């Protein structure tokens, strides 16, 4: 009741690497904790990972003379008794600055009730079919990302082209003001004398500037419309990836959960490796 073997404890997880511990405590509430074997692998260490203040603490359960504890006085019969003492009380007694009541242990049994088809045959088919779903979904996501990155580059060079078009149009526009102002003092002299050749050439080529400048504006106009069309598709490509990412993550975790479940139950992965 109060004190059974540490093996049959919902919070004890055995031997899990610190990489696995962090992912289980990630984005969890304050007070969540789980016991596990120490990194050194020496018998009787039982590091107690704790989550307080957004940080994942780490407290080692020292062992000496068949007794366990945190400080040098090991006044506890076993790990279960020691943890249970702090499950109903805060750790301020152990450390003045450490305030937590070890509320929410990460029970290993809860994840158990997520897998069905306890028989080997059914799990083999589900995991194999899930890998096809996970692999197909991942491939589809991979295709979108390359399109998303590719489309990002295309729009960037479209923005620069429009930026350059502003400079070119500005030069022609500015020169028109300068050209018109320049043709102000000699225009009267041309009108005074009957020289039609100068008028035709001045007007003929002056319109050429208008024609050339008009073409520049039209060319820029098409680019802006193309940029708008390209930009809209850029968001649509982004929309698909945003809605595919959450589904891919869930499939990957569920697929991994089945894979570990099969291996843990005394099954060599060589048979599963060919199953894929």
């Amino acid at each position: 009741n109060n004190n059974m073997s540490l093996q049959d404890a919902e919070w004890y997880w055995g031997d899990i690497s610190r990489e696995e511990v962090n992912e289980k405590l990630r984005d969890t509430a304050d007070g969540t904790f789980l016991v596990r074997d120490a990194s050194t692998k020496m018998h009787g260490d039982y590091t107690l990972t704790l989550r307080k203040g957004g940080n994942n603490k780490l407290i080692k359960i020292f062992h000496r003379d068949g007794k366990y504890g945190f400080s040098d006085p090991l006044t506890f019969s076993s790990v279960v008794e020691l943890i249970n003492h702090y499950r109903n009380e805060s750790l301020a007694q152990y450390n003045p600055k450490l305030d937590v009541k070890l509320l929410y242990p990460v029970s290993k049994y809860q994840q158990d009730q997520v897998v069905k088809e306890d028989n080997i045959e059914a799990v083999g088919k589900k995991l194999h079919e899930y890998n096809t779903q996970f692999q197909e979904k991942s491939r589809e996501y991979d295709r979108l990302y390359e399109e998303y990155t590719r489309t990002s580059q295309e729009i960037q060079m479209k923005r620069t082209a429009i930026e350059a078009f502003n400079e070119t149009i500005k030069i022609f526009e500015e020169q028109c003001q300068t050209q018109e102002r320049y043709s102000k003092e000699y225009i009267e002299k041309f009108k005074r004398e009957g020289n039609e050749k100068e008028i035709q050439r001045i007007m003929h080529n002056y319109d050429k500037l208008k024609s050339r400048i008009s073409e520049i504006i039209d060319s820029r106009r098409r680019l802006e419309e193309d940029l708008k069309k390209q930009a809209a598709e850029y968001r649509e490509i982004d929309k698909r990836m945003n809605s595919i990412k959450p589904d891919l993550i869930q499939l990957r975790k569920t697929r991994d959960q089945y894979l570990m479940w099969l291996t843990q139950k005394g099954v060599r992965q060589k048979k599963l490796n060919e199953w894929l």
Binding site: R18, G54, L58, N166, E167, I171, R201, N205, N242, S243
Partner: protein, 977 residues
């Protein structure tokens, strides 16, 4: 690319329309290669058939201004430039009267070409920090320039030809045994001006003799302050007063049993080539508050409307904003969240409250926030997926707490990231204003809050305030690797004995993690210990520069250790990681940037690689501006090397453009059509002149000569890599080599391969000094852009696949080795294949590089073995010993009973001695990977990836225990042996 927008083809004759000052328009048909000087001459004698001419009054006083492809209106002051290379946006050229300095504008055109962006871009930024950095970084540029010109033209030479020496004057014992009485036979080559006739010299001199007596003693055999010593071949000179064996070239000859041949060159001749350093300050160089500790209120941030988020209204139920104050990577409090709102009206008119008081905010605090979308479906499941992220510094570079409204642009989520927040990221707004935008508003205190200066912190510290037998625990903690787990009992133990840790300077990184950073009382005390801390080795002080130690004072102390201990020999080795650390700096004006820039402006070998490492990372939009400002400052004061860097950049651009057509346009064709097409587009003068007569980016000492179009094909591997072949311009080419072969890859990431080739070099240096003769061949690799790089080619190397195909079993590799070298050299060739084979077994297993086959394993005719094509590492214990049966025959000298042979037993011994040697240096390798987390490699996202090294090296186990872990792995792969 190309010579015009969109159209990369340049017709020989094009109707180029100019704009004369009088507002006139006239069309011209110039040449593609015609210089702008000629264009002006022809253009001016073409207006006589036009309305007005009196305004011209001369042919000069006009600059031919126009627009470029970078959206920049270039001035074209250098009229000698050809119209082809002007990068015109559209055919047109406006004639304008000269304006500006006319000399500083020319430089800005060369600086822009090298950096890749117009220099005017930095001048259009209104950010006060961007402009302040530009005007302040010129102090380091000026100091370095003055430093170079201190003694004489000699000081100028040492800048352009930095001696490549080693920080190890004493030779390893085993190599010293290679010298008969500590003397090395060297042949000195002296060239006589009449007919340029060669000459010989046999010299037997002591290893520990500087070039001064080498040169003088050689004169006695001829039968002063001149006649410098140069390496026959590449540009490498023996100038500084060092022991002869101290240099890298002479040491390499000793290790490989070769007689170094050197050239005698007159000193005056070398100084003639040295140009003058003309560094002129640019135009931009000439152009109350209450302490933070008195503000009593919790840090409160108000969120507001998000401009827009790309989320489907039906796929995702609701969205919310997650925030949290971080210091480095560790939060300073619990992450706060905003009320979930439908993803159609992201209003969030909410005040966020944090559990941290304002006075307790560390100077390096950041506000990491992100937009997360909660699914809230699947019955009893709640999945959060980030939509964007953005970091905000709480103190601008002036030590002022951010106050008032502020608009922040979010970043796209990195690939393969699932954490809601991204604390390890660049703290700034997205330059692309067309992304999600989050509006924040920090509360106003009726005044500007300034972080207390140094004096105030000192008063608070030491104001609130013998030996111990159990000091062995402090010693034990120091040796633990950086990634090791530290318990709360040790954290509370290091801090209590912080004053006794000064006697163990190696414990500083561990004592920096035991201090609560959200408590000004504890942080104040720490600043005192760091102030008067003993200096540590650069290897240990290099780990205080990564993302785990963001305090400005902690990083400043680390840099001061680099300055006084980091030799230019080691600086060039770790320079790959030091550049990456520049992305972890909070602000643009750091102490590391001033240290890095001072070294680049003093050494031309460091500057060469400093330029290329920064340049290759300019495609990233996160560090595009930070590195762009860093390159512009260097390019302005780099001196006359910018002319050489223009040849390389221009040359590399031709290959990139050419290589993009063989994989984009002519990709669905045969192998002979591509080769003829590739050969066709190399005889053109534009391509021919650009790809000749410039230094090789991989090794600046190698000046690439005339191209050899006959022997340049397309590698039938990867994605059409291009096998380019060059010549050796110097007359002394046959001594070293007569061909510089370089593989130009365009489409493969060369950063994983560039980092592996550097870990191999460090591994081989550890074993060389220890005593082991494990010889590896870490060829030269370099990344010059986005998934484009160059690879050096090793001479006379065939893959194991080639021999099997050409040798046609299991004795083909051994049979070929026997045929190539028969006689007394067979034993050496069999022992070189053994030492080389053993070295790559330990290195390959530790790093877990991609699986090897007979296609990416090369064996030289001398018997040496080396690996190529380093695909991936650490991802793709669970990796076996790559040794295969094809090598046991060679190891056992052809014996069939290889399993329990005497030769094989010696092979196992050298594998254990190599494995244990690296295990004792695991700290160095853990720190190298810890400085590349932000690099962006797909397999180096976080410290989780680096956990592979801690497992293959068996760091937690015992030294004796770790040995049998390697034993089990080696036997398991071979199923015994």
């Amino acid at each position: 690319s190309g010579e015009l927008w969109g159209i990369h083809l340049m017709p020989p004759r094009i109707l180029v329309e100019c704009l004369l000052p009088n507002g006139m328009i006239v069309t011209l048909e110039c040449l593609r290669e015609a210089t702008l000087i000629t264009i002006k001459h022809e253009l001016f004698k073409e207006a006589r058939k036009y309305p007005l001419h009196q305004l011209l009054q001369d042919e000069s006083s006009y600059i031919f201004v126009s627009v470029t492809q970078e959206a920049e209106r270039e001035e074209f002051f250098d009229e000698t430039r050809r119209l082809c290379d002007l990068r015109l946006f559209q055919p047109f050229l406006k004639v304008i009267e000269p304006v500006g300095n006319r000399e500083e504008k020319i430089l800005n055109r060369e600086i822009g070409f090298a950096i890749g962006m117009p220099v005017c871009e930095f001048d259009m930024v209104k950010d006060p920090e961007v402009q302040d950095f530009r005007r302040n970084i010129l102090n380091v540029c000026k100091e370095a320039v003055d430093l170079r010109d201190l003694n004489s033209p000699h000081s100028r030479a040492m800048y352009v030809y930095p001696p490549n020496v080693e920080s190890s004057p004493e030779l390893p014992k085993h190599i010293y045994n290679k010298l008969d009485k500590g003397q090395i036979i060297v042949v000195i080559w002296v060239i006589v001006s009449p007919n340029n006739d060669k000459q010989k010299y046999t010299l037997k001199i002591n290893h520990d003799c500087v070039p001064e007596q080498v040169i003088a003693e050689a004169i006695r055999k001829k039968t002063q302050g001149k006649y410098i010593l140069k390496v026959c071949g590449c540009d490498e000179y023996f100038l500084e007063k060092y022991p002869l064996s101290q240099y890298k070239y002479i040491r390499s000859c000793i290790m490989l049993g070769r007689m170094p041949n050197l050239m005698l060159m007159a000193k005056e001749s070398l100084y003639s080539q040295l140009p003058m350093d003309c560094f002129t300050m640019p135009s931009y160089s000439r152009r109350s508050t209450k302490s933070l500790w008195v503000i009593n209120s919790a840090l409160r941030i108000k969120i507001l409307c998000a401009t827009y988020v790309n989320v489907n209204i039906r796929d995702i139920d609701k969205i919310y904003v997650r925030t949290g104050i971080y210091h480095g990577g560790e939060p300073l409090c619990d992450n706060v969240n905003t009320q979930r709102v439908p993803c159609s009206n992201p209003r969030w008119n909410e005040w966020l409250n944090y559990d941290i008081y304002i006075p307790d905010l560390p100077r390096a605090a950041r506000l990491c926030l992100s937009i997360c979308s909660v699914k809230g479906r699947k019955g009893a499941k709640e999945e959060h997926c980030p939509l964007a992220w953005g970091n905000i510094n709480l103190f601008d570079y002036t030590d002022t707490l951010v106050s008032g409204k502020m608009a922040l642009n979010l970043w796209p989520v990195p690939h393969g990231l699932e954490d809601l927040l991204n604390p390890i990221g660049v703290t700034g707004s997205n330059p692309n204003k067309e992304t999600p935008c989050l509006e924040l508003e920090f509360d106003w205190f009726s005044s500007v809050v300034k972080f207390p200066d140094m004096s105030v912190i000192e008063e608070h510290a030491n104001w609130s305030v013998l030996r111990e037998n159990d000091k062995e625990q402090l010693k034990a903690i120091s040796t633990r690797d950086p990634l090791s787990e530290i318990t709360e009992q040790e954290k509370d133990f290091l801090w209590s004995h912080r004053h006794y840790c000064v006697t163990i300077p190696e414990i500083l990184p561990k004592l920096l993690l035991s201090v609560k950073w959200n408590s000004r009382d504890e942080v104040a005390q720490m600043y005192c210990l760091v102030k008067d801390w003993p200096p540590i080795k650069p290897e240990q002080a290099m780990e205080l520069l990564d993302c785990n130690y963001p305090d400005p004072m902690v990083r400043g102390f680390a840099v001061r250790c680099l300055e006084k201990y980091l030799t230019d020999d080691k600086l060039s080795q770790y320079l790959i990681q030091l550049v990456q650390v520049l992305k972890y700096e909070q602000y643009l004006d750091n102490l590391l940037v001033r240290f890095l820039l001072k070294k680049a402006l003093t050494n031309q070998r460091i500057g060469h690689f400093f330029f290329w490492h920064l340049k290759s990372e300019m495609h990233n939009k996160t560090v595009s501006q930070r590195f762009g400002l860093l390159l512009e400052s260097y390019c302005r004061a780099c001196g006359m090397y910018l002319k050489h860097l223009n040849r390389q950049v221009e040359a590399m651009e031709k290959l990139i453009n050419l290589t993009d057509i063989l994989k984009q346009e002519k990709k669905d064709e045969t192998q002979k059509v591509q080769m003829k097409f590739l050969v066709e587009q190399m005889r053109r003068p534009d391509f021919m002149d650009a790809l000749q007569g410039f230094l090789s980016p991989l090794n600046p000492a190698h000046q690439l000569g005339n191209l050899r179009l006959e022997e340049c094909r397309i590698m039938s591997s990867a994605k059409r890599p291009l096998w380019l072949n060059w010549e050796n311009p110097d007359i002394m080419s046959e001594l070293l080599f007569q061909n510089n072969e370089i593989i130009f890859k365009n489409g493969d990431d060369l950063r994983q391969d560039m980092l592996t080739l550097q870990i191999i070099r460090i591994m081989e240096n550890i074993w060389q000094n220890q005593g082991l003769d494990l010889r590896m061949l870490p060829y030269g690799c370099l990344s010059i852009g986005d998934c484009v790089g160059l690879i050096e080619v090793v001479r006379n190397s065939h893959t194991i696949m080639q021999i099997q195909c050409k040798g046609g079993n299991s004795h083909t590799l051994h049979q070929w080795l026997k045929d190539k070298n028969k006689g007394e050299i067979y034993d050496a060739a069999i022992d070189l294949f053994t030492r080389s084979c053993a070295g790559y077994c330990v290195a390959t297993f530790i790093l877990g590089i991609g699986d090897r086959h007979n296609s990416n394993i090369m064996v030289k005719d001398d018997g040496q073995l080396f690996h190529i094509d380093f695909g991936h590492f650490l991802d793709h214990e669970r990796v076996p010993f790559v040794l295969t049966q094809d090598f046991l025959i060679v190891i056992s000298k052809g014996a069939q009973e290889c399993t329990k042979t005497r030769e094989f037993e010696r092979f196992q011994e050298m594998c254990y001695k190599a494995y244990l040697a690296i295990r004792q240096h695991a700290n160095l390798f853990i720190n190298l990977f810890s400085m590349m987390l932000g690099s962006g490699m797909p397999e180096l996202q976080s410290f989780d990836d680096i956990a592979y090294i801690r497992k293959t090296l068996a760091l937690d186990k015992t030294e004796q225990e770790a040995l049998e872990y390697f034993m089990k792995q080696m036997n398991d792969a071979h199923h015994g042996g």
